[PDB]
């Protein structure tokens, strides 16, 4: 049934069900909930641990990214979703200061599809942050031929897109995106980008970026997942699987 981000089952750890535990997907806009009430039902030693961490809304993301265990990261993500709602949903308001980071990553790195016809709608959308309304409508034919049949030329732009998205969804989202880059399974990105589109409908540039990510994900190519040989630094195991509840 529904996933519980406080205690997550071993079968449930996948990019999709983890994607369901992201902070913005919790649909909490307002009225922050204090940490002791968030963790209220959980082991006592765990509660004392979280109090000893002295989480704040600013650095909770750093705690998520530094942790080595995915269940704990999801827990901190849920604590962020209940504790810091304005921070979580700020990115969706157009030209809010949360957008500056992924916009800057867009300007800093140019797609390989943009070295041919730099005036393509998307290339202007990442370059100048203008004409972002519909990126996948304009020149889609040309991009469709460019990306189709080429694994490498597609993986390059996909990776850069994955970095910008790392800056769009901090915390859990970031780590999931990292998983993509390492596992080279790029279709799982749907679960991240899909949920991002309905919240972002007000933001024009974000909506355009997400529509294009939808487009380049729909490219016609066959790429092989490369799960890690170590089996470590992956979601399944090892090692510890904390369950708070």
């Amino acid at each position, epitope marked *: 049934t529904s996933i519980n981000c406080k205690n997550i089952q071993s079968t449930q750890l996948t990019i999709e069900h983890l994607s369901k535990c992201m902070a913005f997907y919790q649909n909490k806009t*307002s*009225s*922050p909930v*204090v*940490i*002791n009430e968030i963790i209220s039902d959980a082991s006592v030693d765990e509660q004392e641990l*979280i*109090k000893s961490l*002295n*989480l*704040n*809304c*600013n650095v909770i993301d750093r705690f998520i990214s530094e942790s080595s265990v995915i269940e704990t990261q999801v827990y901190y993500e849920y604590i962020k979703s209940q*504790l810091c709602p*304005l*921070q979580v949903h*700020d990115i969706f*308001t157009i030209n*809010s*200061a949360s957008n500056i980071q992924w916009k800057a990553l867009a300007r800093s790195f140019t797609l390989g599809v943009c070295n041919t016809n730099p005036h393509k709608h998307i290339c202007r959308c990442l370059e100048s942050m203008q004409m972002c309304t519909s990126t996948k409508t304009d020149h889609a034919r040309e991009m469709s031929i460019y990306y189709d049949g080429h694994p490498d030329r597609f993986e390059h732009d996909m990776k850069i897109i994955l970095n910008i998205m790392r800056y769009i969804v901090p915390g859990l989202g970031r780590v999931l995106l990292d998983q993509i880059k390492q596992t080279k399974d790029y279709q799982a990105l749907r679960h991240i980008q899909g949920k991002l589109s309905p919240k972002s409908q007000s933001n024009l540039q974000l909506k355009g970026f997400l529509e294009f990510v939808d487009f380049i994900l729909g490219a016609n190519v066959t790429i092989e997942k490369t799960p890690q040989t170590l089996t470590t630094l992956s979601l399944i195991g090892g090692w510890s699987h904390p369950q708070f509840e």
Partner: antibody, heavy 121, light 108 residues
Framework: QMQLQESGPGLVKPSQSLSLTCTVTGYSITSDSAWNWIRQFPGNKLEWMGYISYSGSTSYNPSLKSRISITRDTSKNQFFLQLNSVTTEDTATYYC???????????????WGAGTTVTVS | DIQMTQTTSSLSASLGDRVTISCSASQGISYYLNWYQQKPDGTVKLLIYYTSSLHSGVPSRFSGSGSGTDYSLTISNLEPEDIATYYCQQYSKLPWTFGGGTKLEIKG
């Protein structure tokens, strides 16, 4: 249901320390939050002086960082401000408040003292 | 460090009016802001925390708003107990700073 009060001398003329005692009634400083001293200068200008945490961590405004000291007594459940090398600029109304850490209650200044006006020269 | 500026130092309005007080920030605070009321006798009590949220016990007439570097406090209908000096605070990062303050007065 807690309340705080500041107990302090009326004035000290310059080159001396000014010390105040914030007594916290109805709460345990050990248990949680951050305990702060905040002075309002004449003309209604507010300045955050510094705080001591529930665990004893100290953070001071870098403007005052040299001469300011904030201690606490867990026994009588008090915490003390000492601002040394006072000048005529330090004349002001000094409060002591509680900044909540995000654990038991959100981040803000919750309970405030009535304030004690201490003067220089 | 982070300088908070209240554009209006003092303001007068009649009772029952709708008063708005503006708080500007030197840089982006990312929503971390508080609103305090210092009455004439000197008692200071928290009005608004986290920029939207209204503290427990504060009357329904007060509403916070704003985002980014710009923030607003709104008293919907002005009652005589509200006459006082108002302050805004950024907890973004230390050292914490306060606005210049806005004193309310009666027309009346």
């Amino acid at each position: 249901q807690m309340q705080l009060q500041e107990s302090g001398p009326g004035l000290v003329k310059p080159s001396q320390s000014l010390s105040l005692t914030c007594t916290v009634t109805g709460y345990s400083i050990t248990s949680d939050s951050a305990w702060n001293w905040i002075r309002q200068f004449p003309g209604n200008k507010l300045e955050w002086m510094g705080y001591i945490s529930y665990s004893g961590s100290t953070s001071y405004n870098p403007s005052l960082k040299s001469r300011i000291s904030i201690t606490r007594d867990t026994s009588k459940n008090q915490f003390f401000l000492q601002l040394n090398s006072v000048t005529t600029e330090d004349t002001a109304t000094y409060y002591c408040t509680r900044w909540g850490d995000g654990y038991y209650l959100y981040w803000y200044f919750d309970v405030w003292g009535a304030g004690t006006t201490v003067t220089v020269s | 460090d982070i300088q908070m500026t209240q554009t209006t130092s003092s303001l007068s309005a009649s009772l029952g009016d709708r008063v708005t007080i503006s708080c500007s920030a030197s840089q982006g605070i990312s929503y971390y802001l508080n609103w305090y009321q210092q009455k004439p006798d000197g008692t200071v009590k928290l009005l608004i925390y986290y920029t939207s949220s209204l503290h427990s016990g504060v009357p329904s007439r007060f509403s916070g708003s704003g985002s980014g570097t710009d923030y607003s406090l709104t008293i919907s209908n002005l009652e005589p107990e509200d006459i006082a000096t108002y302050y805004c605070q950024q907890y973004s990062k230390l050292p914490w700073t306060f606005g210049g303050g806005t004193k309310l007065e009666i027309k009346g």
